[PDB]
Amino acid sequence: ATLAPNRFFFMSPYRSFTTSGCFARFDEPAVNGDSPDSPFQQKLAALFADAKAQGIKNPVMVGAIPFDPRQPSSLYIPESWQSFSRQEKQASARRFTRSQSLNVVERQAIPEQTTFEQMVARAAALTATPQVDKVVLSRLIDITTDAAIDSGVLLERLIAQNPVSYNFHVPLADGGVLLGASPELLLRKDGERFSSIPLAGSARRQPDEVLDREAGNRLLASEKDRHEHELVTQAMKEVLRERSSELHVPSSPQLITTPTLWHLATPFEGKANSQENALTLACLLHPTPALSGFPHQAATQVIAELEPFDRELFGGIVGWCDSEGNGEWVVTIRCAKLRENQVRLFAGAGIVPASSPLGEWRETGVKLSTMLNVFGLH
Ligand SMILES: C=C(O[C@H]1C=CC=C(C(=O)O)[C@@H]1O)C(=O)O
Numbered sequence: 001a002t003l004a005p006n007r008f009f010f011m012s013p014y015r016s017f018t019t020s021g022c023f024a025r026f027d028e029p030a031v032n033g034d035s036p037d038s039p040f041q042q043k044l045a046a047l048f049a050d051a052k053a054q055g056i057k058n059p060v061m062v063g064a065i066p067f068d069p070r071q072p073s074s075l076y077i078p079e080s081w082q083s084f085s086r087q088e089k090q091a092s093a094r095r096f097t098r099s100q101s102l103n104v105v106e107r108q109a110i111p112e113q114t115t116f117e118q119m120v121a122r123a124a125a126l127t128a129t130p131q132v133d134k135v136v137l138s139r140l141i142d143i144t145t146d147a148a149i150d151s152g153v154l155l156e157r158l159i160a161q162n163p164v165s166y167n168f169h170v171p172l173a174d175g176g177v178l179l180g181a182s183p184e185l186l187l188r189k190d191g192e193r194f195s196s197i198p199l200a201g202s203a204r205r206q207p208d209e210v211l212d213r214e215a216g217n218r219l220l221a222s223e224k225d226r227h228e229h230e231l232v233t234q235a236m237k238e239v240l241r242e243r244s245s246e247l248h249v250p251s252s253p254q255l256i257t258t259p260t261l262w263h264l265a266t267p268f269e270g271k272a273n274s275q276e277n278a279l280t281l282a283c284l285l286h287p288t289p290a291l292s293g294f295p296h297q298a299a300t301q302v303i304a305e306l307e308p309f310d311r312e313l314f315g316g317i318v319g320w321c322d323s324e325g326n327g328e329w330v331v332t333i334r335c336a337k338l339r340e341n342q343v344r345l346f347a348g349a350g351i352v353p354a355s356s357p358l359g360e361w362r363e364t365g366v367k368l369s370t371m372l373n374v375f376g377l378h
């Protein structure tokens with residue numbers, strides 16, 4: 001049995017659930033969604049009361065928000081939801097046997113290696129200057145297949161290969177499915193308590209648990225990545241100052257893993273005002289310098305002049321919140337948009353003065369391989 005493409009699914013060490021039905025869609029842009037006087041929040045709160053009044057106990061709001069919060073949002077309240085056991089689902093997925101044979105008929109890197117290296121070069125150059133210190137640049141892989149892609153079977157494969165990550169499956173207004181295995185927590189809020197766990201900095205994992213246990217330790221030392229990382233953490237520090245009652249931040253990062261990568265992480269733990277819910281804080285933080293750059297608005301402008309595509313939901317956030325200030329939001333990376341027989345993958349890095357284009361090209365390549373492995377490609 002597999003999940004139908006019109007259900008939301010979210011797999012997390014916090015709350016893991018599915019959803020059924022669609023009481024109300026919510027397209028409203030999330031810009032200035034960090035202040036509760038915002039159209040986004042007033043509309044959001046309007047719709048929650050609408051839902052409760054109309055008979056829905058414990059409404060939740062689910063879906064994704066795009067990189068650029070001006071662009072519209074892909075949220076909606078389901079008619080219902082249904083908790084499930086993370087560990088139970090890991091085990092069923094690892095046994096899910098029957099897969100789909102897929103024939104690719106086109107595969108396009110957008111852009112290809114050379115154009116990407118020139119974009120990495122022209123971006124690193126501009127970080128050396130007073131104009132920006134960090135920009136994140138991304139690329140895509142477009143895949144056309146000869147038959148519609150079964151979203152449910154693919155999701156089982158993704159769980160089996162990515163047991164530990166924040167795994168999501170989002171129905172879109174166009175009939176598509178946004179799907180991925182994010183390692184990066186952008187914002188959890190459990191009652192009054194909140195955390196965020198930004199990543200930045202990467203190294204390949206190795207098959208041998210000797211060269212693996214040390215390729216990591218290298219990551220912990222590499223000044224390139226340690227500096228990559230500090231830009232993200234200083235910025236999130238400043239932004240949370242007058243938004244959080246308390247706030248604890250380690251000054252040095254720690255190692256975490258995906259099946260493909262070592263990453264550097266810094267956990268944030270704080271308490272926030274009753275003025276705040278899961279999305280006001282998520283909208284505040286996102287995008288961090290791990291997904292856009294630093295300074296944030298200066299780096300969006302390099303991204304627009306350099307990236308030959310619209311990121312749309314990629315590099316956004318995906319998740320949920322309820323009517324009572326709680327929720328979880330993870331960054332939309334290690335992901336794909338599926339629709340009928342067409343798929344788009346996404347990956348970004350991670351660009352400062354010391355970054356070589358061959359390095360970042362291959363870094364994004366390893367990140368893309370999470371979703372390529374789900375598809376059975378290299
Ligand atoms: C943009 C991505 O990663 C971000 C978060 C973890 C590692 C990153 C890096 O080392 O450059 C990126 O800041 C992606 O996986 O597509």
Ligand SMILES: [Mg+2]
Nearest residue numbers: 201202349350
């Ligand atoms: Mg990087």
